[PDB]
Design a binder for this molecule. Sequence first.
Ligand SMILES: *[C@@H](O)[C@@H]1CCC(=O)NCCCCCCn2cc(nn2)C[C@H](NC(=O)OCc2ccccc2)C(=O)N[C@@H](CC2CCCCC2)C(=O)N1
Ligand SMILES: [Cl-]
Ligand SMILES: [Cl-]
Ligand SMILES: [Cl-]
Length: 174
Amino acid sequence: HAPPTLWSRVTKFGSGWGFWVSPTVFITTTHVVPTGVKEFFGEPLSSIAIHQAGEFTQFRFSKKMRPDLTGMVLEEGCPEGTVCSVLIKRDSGELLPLAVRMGAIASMRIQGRLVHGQSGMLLTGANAKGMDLGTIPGDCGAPYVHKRGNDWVVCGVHAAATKSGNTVVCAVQA
Ligand SMILES: *[C@@H](O)[C@@H]1CCC(=O)NCCCCCCn2cc(nn2)C[C@H](NC(=O)OCc2ccccc2)C(=O)N[C@@H](CC2CCCCC2)C(=O)N1
Ligand SMILES: [Cl-]
Ligand SMILES: [Cl-]
Ligand SMILES: [Cl-]
């Protein structure tokens, strides 16, 4: 039930996607960040505070980059059992929320990189028939969000998946 303003925060970035938490804060998965660049979104590196670890990257810009947005809450993962929506966007702009039942926050090594993440299982009963790991786009960086009361919170960014157990991992901030 995510509103259009929430989806307007999901942005193509590098080899994947990221998400505007607020006018000044953008989050993504580290491995999709472009290298050898002198700017992100036109802003020089000298003007961006970067905080990243365990495949979670946060950029805090020195000016309002998306002044259209309200600041929302970024949490360091979510409680076990939370049903999150992964806000997957297609290149066409089509919106594909993917429901996931979240498990435990843990450190993991994935493809030789330390990941500070939260695992989850796709919630088949809350996704369109046939919309699963074998059919979604394979991009990273999409945000994991859930509702706290009536308000949406963001708690991670898509980092990994495996068909074994229909399992996904989001990286989480520390
Ligand atoms: C983004 O860059 C991708 C997102 C992958 C995705 O979501 N694809 C859509 C589903 C397709 C079916 C899964 C394809 N698949 C990829 C792998 N295995 N199967 C490789 C990595 N998976 C893995 O090792 O899982 C084991 C696991 C499960 C649960 C908890 C811990 C470990 C995988 O996903 N690798 C991602 C890139 C690496 C790059 C270095 C930093 C960590 C992530 C990947 O392909 N992400
Ligand atoms: Cl919003
Ligand atoms: Cl880019
Ligand atoms: Cl890092």
